[PDB]
Symmetry: C4
Subunit: 329 residues, 4 copies
């Protein structure tokens, strides 16, 4: 067996120590754009998000209403692939053709959308999603450190080359990152076997090494493990380019689930992809996406300024991160 | 006094980090056979289990019905020795002659059975068990780091040579392993004075050193400390060849205890060997052994594939084990 | 990102190990004077407190009655600046002209008072406070590691030179201390992004380095994080010259808030500066300031003698501080 | 300030790892004698206890009935000095002249008794205690790292030389041990500012260094912090010669307090020396001392044999002590 010295930590065991704030660092001046897909040294990503938030590839969160509402604020949704190929493509088409502000829009001024895909029916599913207008694809899996991901990406590259953008994984260490990077993934999702903070720190380190070695920068996504807005700032500071959230978005008016009034409290349904529908429960109703996202990002921008950073890249180089003692928590 | 630097950890403080999964790694392809008794370099163990699970040497778990049901699935039971020599031998005989699938069977196609023995009446007890047809014996003790174990094994070797297989101990460090290894034990039980995970890791390390030094491989058994199926995978990954469980098997229809309906919930009786019958309580009734064991082992096989291993030996060399922070738990 | 090895600790994870107590170390002989403002090698601070306690710059704690009561015991209050410039100046004037024992008094035998100021209206506010008779000023901010603090101090030095004493900050590391030290702050407040004990230890270390480099000693203030009297002794031992407390003083008869009887228990109102009035709650009523402060300081003096120190400076050099294990707490 | 790297641990964070048990190690063969007072290389202590247990210098535990009952089993009590000199001397006299088995008896076959003394009235108190027949004296104090202890011991040595045995302290580190050792203390009490286990380990280390340097062996006493019988074995293994217990003995029929029946449960009164009578509560009634002590020591003897030791000195050299993880607890 191979053992690891330091134990892995969660986002709750960390704190950002303030840096120097200049007079020009005010929330309104903070830029939250981030690259969504890989590019090489000297270039910009073909797709850049206006806000570093993306919605999870789930039935209870990423539907057409969520996709439209999120794209309007600058983020992107990955319509769930846990439905028929015909239904998913229909949903993708619905978002693309909806029209007829930090809106994430394409050349034809249509909202951007991503779609989740699996390692089984990709041959039939990918073409349908591409035809429907999907802007980005992401292989949905809790453990993407497998041949199956390599094969799926390979088929896509053979059939479409670099025309089709495929995100992949859910790896927790540099070894898994490296494997998917070589396989051809446009961005890599982090999160499973390891505390979220350590996973991010380790993968980002490998990602940086890979960039110095190949000149190719692959954006990484922290998927889950975020319990508070502060954790959002921490994930980005540690090197994640954007964050994927499930429960956070399922509370909104736009999530596909039903609102349920349980003795005074209005809730929304929420179940996991691995549920027999994994969990099935409720999240407190929070209203419309816009107002909530705005509240969250305003707090992220302020924290960024406490760290003396006007952009995510600055935050990532300037951030002073410290571990907190168990007793302190 | 002699002090130790790192504190000992339990199985709950560890996590397996995924390795590369090949297309050929599917639960159905995973082989769970393990050696039960020592053998030397270039040979196979005389006895190999089909599944790495063995039932505890207890009154509330290892009876004749349990022995038959477990042997049928590929494991083995150690009939409790906390009864008369005549009763225990009768039970051994009952299992051996029951007949008249991963069944653990002998040359005459009879189910395999083990029996627990103590360091007191072995002179009268061993012969009776051997005559009755016992396939393996195990010295039952919570602290086997004593002269008494050496003496008992010695008597057996003098009287029967290597014809009779005796398991021994319950040691927690390499020093105790080494002592019992030299004494002649065919396999060594781990578990007491030390967190289960650390105990396993340390003994296995000594076991490996001993194998390189003598060419003799002695299988080790993690006895207790397993609270979940995942812990089963962890114990094997850390180097244990098979696991001994008590409470796990006492829930089944086949354990020797009484089913008790306590206001809606059907339970089964469970008491420790050191009880005044140690504890005396209840475990939730789980039904027949077969269905439960199958559920557990299916989850072990999947995890193994997440680690990219098709056999226990591969798991033991490929496993990437990390410690988890206190706060993460 | 920049990471830190050791995690930060709170005051609860520390213990003072006794030193040699001489026959001459009795509570009555302990001297609790401390410097409030910076001075250079070979000189005494222009202002020295008789007791190391100062009240927080809050609406629910630092009013005119509190200022008079605290100054009478040897400490000083910083009248809150979260009110109009006219009101705050009036309050300052009220304390200065109240007259017509470890009393902290000036040349004209008038009680000493401090006032909180912000980085916005200082141009209009500072002159009013100075004219009103304010003895010390302190920039109120949770994160003072910013250009805004430098600018405010700079304006004051340009307009008044070293005639006006300005405290600043709320930094948690040496880098923030250094910045405010160079900016011209007369004393620096510690406390936010980092466990209180570690913050104090790190800043004090920098403060000591700065003193050796420039010959200027800048007194530091531990603001908050003190839950018990013992923590008071710990903060001073670690190097803090004086302590700022909010909740502690809000319990007294002299705090500006209302006494409220809640089913048998008399409480006092307490709300944070960042409340929509931050929290709004109650603290148990404790009576008059005098009797409580006396009880607290008597316990500090005894502990000091257990450490064999008759003054704070001796405590700071003689203290033997140890970390306590998580389980011990 | 002086800081310490490793945090201090309690007895709950440790475990004894078994050693080799020989056939001759049975509880009945274990010898629990320990030296009570200092002696030099090549000699035996003038006073040796038959069991390593001594009762605390408290009003709720060490009275004449307790002293007689404990001496009969081989231990010794230190009659409380928190009473008049006349009362304490009377109690000492009562035990000495009571007569008219591991009994701790003197030359005249009278039970042995100790008495607590303070650093104030020793001039009047010591002579009275000596005249009354006190066999050993102990300076009662929670922090004995002071000039006052040196002075008291000095007076005694000047007046009586080495004829009168005085125990001293309550120190937690080697520095405090060293000070009292040089002052002339016959034995030193450990326990306060530091986790009990670490305190014992550190003082014992200093005690060993002192013995190698001077040839004088000073017995150390672990005072308090023992919550279970296992902790007793741990304290001795770590190097403490004997243990002082308060609550443990206050449960017995022989403690000086009142038995109180509180709705079905018979309790005994228990208050601390620093109580306004410190705490005042109840401990569960346990019956007569004999039966309880016997149960405790039988468990200590067995554990000793699991460590392969027939005497305390063997235990102290053979013990394999490991730290346990926070999560394991």
């Amino acid at each position: 067996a191979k053992y690891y010295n330091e134990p892995c930590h969660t986002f709750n065991e960390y704190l950002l120590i303030p840096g120097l704030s200049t007079v020009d660092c005010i929330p309104s001046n903070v830029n939250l754009s981030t690259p969504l897909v890989k590019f090489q040294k000297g270039q910009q990503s073909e797709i850049n998000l206006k806000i570093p938030l993306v919605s999870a590839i789930m039935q209870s969160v990423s539907g057409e209403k969520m996709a439209i509402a999120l794209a309007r604020e600058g983020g992107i949704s990955f319509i769930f692939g846990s439905q028929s190929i015909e239904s998913q493509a229909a949903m993708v088409h619905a978002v693309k053709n909806f029209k007829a502000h930090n809106e994430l829009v394409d050349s034809q001024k249509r909202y951007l959308v991503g779609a989740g895909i699996n390692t089984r029916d990709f041959r039939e599913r990918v073409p349908a999603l591409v035809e429907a207008g999907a802007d980005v694809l992401c292989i949905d899996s809790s453990d993407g450190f497998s041949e199956w991901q390599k094969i799926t990406i390979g088929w896509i590259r053979e059939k479409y080359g670099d025309k089709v953008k495929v995100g992949a994984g859910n790896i927790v260490d540099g070894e898994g990152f490296r494997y998917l990077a070589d396989a051809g993934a446009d961005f890599i999702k982090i999160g499973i076997g390891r505390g979220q903070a350590t996973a991010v720190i380790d993968v980002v380190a490998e990602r940086n090494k890979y960039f110095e070695e190949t000149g190719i920068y692959i954006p990484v996504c922290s998927d889950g493990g975020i319990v508070y807005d502060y954790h959002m700032t921490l994930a980005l500071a540690m090197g994640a380019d954007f964050i994927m959230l499930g429960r956070y978005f399922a509370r909104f008016e736009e999530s596909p689930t039903r609102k349920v009034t349980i003795n005074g409290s209005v809730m929304k349904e929420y179940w996991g992809e691995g549920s027999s529908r994994g969990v099935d429960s409720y999240v407190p109703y929070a209203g419309k996406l816009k107002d909530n996202v705005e509240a969250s990002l305003n707090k992220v921008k302020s924290t960024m300024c406490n760290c003396g950073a006007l952009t995510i890249p600055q935050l990532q180089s300037k951030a002073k991160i410290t571990l907190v003692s168990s007793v302190s928590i």
